[PDB]
Amino acid sequence: VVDWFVNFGDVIAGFTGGYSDDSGATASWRFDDKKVFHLKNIPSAMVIV
Amino acid sequence: DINFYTRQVIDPRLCGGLAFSPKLNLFRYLDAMSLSWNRSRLKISRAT
Numbered sequence: 001v002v003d004w005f006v007n008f009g010d011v012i013a014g015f016t017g018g019y020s021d022d023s024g025a026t027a028s029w030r031f032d033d034k035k036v037f038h039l040k041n042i043p044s045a046m047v048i049v
Numbered sequence: 050d051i052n053f054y055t056r057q058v059i060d061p062r063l064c065g066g067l068a069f070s071p072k073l074n075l076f077r078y079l080d081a082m083s084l085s086w087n088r089s090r091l092k093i094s095r096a097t
Contacts, residue, residue: 032084032087032090033084034080034084035081036076036077036080036081038077043077044073046073046076046077048076048080
């Protein structure tokens with residue numbers, strides 16, 4: 001028990017020396033575009049994208 | 050004396066149209082503004 005306590009104490013005391021880590025960034029696109037176009041002067045003709 | 054029966058298709062390549070084609074009056078309809086629910090989707094995704 002005393003060995004466990006002293007090990008815990010020395011570990012929890014020895015942390016301040018270093019403090020740093022990494023990072024990351026993402027770039028994402030989502031497309032859900034359902035577009036409609038009319039053949040102008042011919043409304044019957046039409047195109048869906 | 051002739052007596053027989055036949056049944057024929059309406060050759061939809063040539064005929065079979067000549068109707069309203071319910072695609073239209075609905076495709077030119079709200080399909081754009083209804084799609085514009087991307088606003089609401091972005092709103093919910095922001096808090097998601």
